[PDB]
Amino acid sequence: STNDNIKDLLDWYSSGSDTFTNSEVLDNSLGSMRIKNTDGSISLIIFPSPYYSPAFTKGEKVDLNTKRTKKSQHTSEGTYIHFQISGVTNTEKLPTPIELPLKVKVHGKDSPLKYWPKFDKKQLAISTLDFEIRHALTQIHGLYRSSDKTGGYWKITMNDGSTYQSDLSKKFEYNTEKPPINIDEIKTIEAEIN
């Protein structure tokens, strides 16, 4: 049986994510952007981190790999509005798709089952990689679904040796997110469930 916090994390990481390509910036303030998507909807996206606030200006095209922080709503004129957080990158594509080699350990043992996330975008926000990794961990390895699978961490090491990591026992820290990275420079991604 898991406590209330672990249930909240399970809900967060199993409630899907929004993916839009070539949306257009309508406005960009200090840490909030207003973007019109290809289906007619508008997304109000916030950027709480002092280390990641996108520079895109009115008219530019962007890609969204993000999560809603509350329920989408309709304005009196009938426009559908999404309230999201982070997840805005440039539209640059890679020649062919690449498979990120995710390496998983559970209670100190190499999981023999392999899930390799596949992307064709040159860059992704750290927050998007966190959601993809954890979504796999909860769905395939049972993270958060039982009192013995509730913590550990994921770790990305780049080609130049710099590293990014997150604690599985707490929600991803949005307030300190660093800028998006290029996926073709990722050397290894590893996750360990305690």
Q: Which of 88, 118, 141 is where one domain is finished?
A: 88
Q: Give break positions in the chain: residue before each, C–N beyond 2.5 Å.
A: none
Residues 150 and 177 in one domain: yes
Tell me the residue type at 30: L
Residues 145 and 66 in one domain: no
Q: What is the CATH number of the domain that holds 155?
A: 3.10.20.120
Q: What are the residue ranges of helices labelled H in the chain? A: 4-13, 126-140
Residues 100 and 164 in one domain: yes
Residues 96 and 178 in one domain: yes
Pairwise CA distance, residues 166 & 181, whole Å: 15
Residues 135 and 180 in one domain: yes
Pairwise CA distance, residues 192 & 154, whole Å: 6
Distances (CA, A) of 144 to 71, 110, 137: 24, 19, 9
Structure-solving method: X-ray
Total count of domains within the chain:
2
Give the domain range for residue 43.
18-88
Residues 12 and 32 in one domain: no
**Per-residue tokens: 154:** 């994921």
Q: DSSP of 51-101, one letter per residue?
A: T------TT-EEEEEEEESS--EE-TT--EEEEEES-EE--PEEEEEEE--
Residues 63 and 97 in one domain: no
Pairwise CA distance, residues 177 & 139, whole Å: 25
